Write a protein that binds this ligand. Structure first.
Ligand SMILES: CCCN(CCC)C(=O)c1cc(C(N)=O)cc(C(=O)N[C@@H](Cc2cc(F)cc(F)c2)[C@H](O)CNCc2cccc(OC)c2)c1
Length: 371
């Protein structure tokens, strides 16, 4: 826990959350995107149309070239660069300084975002998915090994300019209400989890639960939307369409292409269903659920306009930012588990509320994992 880290994240809707950090000596301040969906720490190290500032190795007395190139291909985009090590600090984070690996970005493609206000990315996931390979120690591992910071961190992402908190080294009890519910981290590469059941407005989607994790399911703060496998995505859109059949929307809408609008303050929230994702518990045949409100998957962009924040995937389920926003998420690396709880900055609806509830009985949860 720590009071100094409570409101240390900012960003703008759909553009990711970022925390401030400093690299080098003397300290070079840079806004770094918080990403539990990758494992590389990378910062702009050369001009780019979208970068307001960038890491200048030359000006840091502590830089150290590792003399190795590097590139990382995300679903979204990619960047290329040169590996090295330098001293890093998080102003509004723990009170420590560590020498970590740093990918100085020299070239990028569809990575940086115009007006995002961040110039680097902090992959908080495990070594196994780090580039060039799992020998390039990710930041958090370095932090844990060099300092006493406990091997744990939590994220409180709040919707709307946007903000939230990244509690390094623990859990801050003033950021959530109710009980925390844990789901096992299936394997230490991405923050993989297993979804055992899915319901829309109470109705079980009735799909073989292997489909829910077809390929895999991960907790990705570096992705905006809720990303579902083809078969699942189709099932939901069909279910969500019917629920809101009272009104009609262009196909481009359900495809995330064109937004929809309503006379300011008249958004028909009630016609959009809640989605319940049931996760594997810590005990035998036990699980729990987190419920998302349409206020979470209908991202805001005169009138009130929104984008359908649920898109299909070819790489498994992705519990993105919009899914994390309603809750306080705990990445308990030490106990290989992820905890969920109603956030202090939860979404609102006079007649409905996002939640984390348990316990539930769910037989054969192991069969839900894909192989
Ligand atoms: C956060 C800003 C919001 N953006 C920004 C662009 C509009 C999104 O909404 C978005 C949409 C999509 C999509 N439409 O599918 C994909 C990504 C994405 O790829 N994010 C990674 C971090 C990242 C943020 C960034 F802003 C730009 C960027 F290029 C990448 C993340 O790490 C992916 N983890 C899974 C993984 C897959 C393959 C390879 C891996 O290797 C480790 C990991 C982000």
């Amino acid at each position: 826990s720590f009071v100094e880290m409570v409101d240390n994240l900012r960003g703008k809707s759909g553009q990711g959350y970022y925390v401030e950090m400093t690299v080098g000596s003397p300290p070079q301040t840079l806004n770094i995107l918080v990403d539990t969906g990758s494992s590389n720490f990378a910062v702009g190290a050369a001009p780019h149309p979208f970068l307001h500032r960038y890491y200048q190795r030359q000006l840091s007395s502590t830089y150290r070239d590792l003399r190795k190139g590097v590139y990382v291909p995300y679903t979204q985009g990619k960047w290329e660069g040169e590996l090295g090590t330098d001293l890093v600090s998080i102003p509004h984070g723990p009170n420590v300084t560590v020498r970590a690996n740093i990918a100085a970005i020299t070239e990028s493609d569809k990575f940086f975002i115009n007006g995002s206000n961040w110039e680097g990315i902090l992959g908080l996931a495990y070594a196994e998915i780090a580039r060039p390979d799992d020998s390039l120690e990710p930041f958090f591992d370095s932090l844990v090994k060099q300092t006493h910071v406990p091997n744990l961190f939590s994220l409180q992402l709040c919707g709307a300019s946007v903000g939230g908190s990244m509690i390094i080294g623990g859990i801050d009890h003033s950021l959530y209400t109710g009980s925390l519910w844990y789901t096992p981290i299936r394997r230490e590469w991405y923050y993989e989890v297993i979804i055992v059941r899915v319901e829309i407005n109470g109705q079980d989607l009735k799909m073989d639960c292997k489909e829910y994790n077809y390929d895999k399911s991960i907790v990705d703060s570096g992705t905006t939307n809720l990303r579902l496998p083809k078969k699942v995505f189709e099932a939901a859109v069909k279910s969500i369409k019917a629920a809101s059949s009272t009104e009609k929307f262009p196909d481009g809408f359900w495809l995330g292409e064109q937004l929809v609008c309503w006379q300011a303050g008249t958004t028909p929230w009630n016609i959009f269903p809640v989605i319940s994702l049931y996760l594997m518990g810590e005990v035998t045949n036990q699980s729990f659920r987190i419920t998302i409100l349409p206020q979470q998957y209908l991202r805001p962009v005169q009138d009130d306009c929104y984008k359908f924040a649920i898109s299909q995937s070819s790489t498994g389920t992705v519990m993105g930012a919009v899914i994390m926003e309603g809750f306080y998420v705990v990445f308990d690396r030490a106990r290989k588990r992820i905890g969920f709880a109603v956030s202090a900055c939860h979404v609102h609806d006079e007649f409905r509320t996002a939640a984390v509830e348990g316990p539930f009985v769910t037989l054969d949860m192991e069969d839900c994992g894909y192989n």
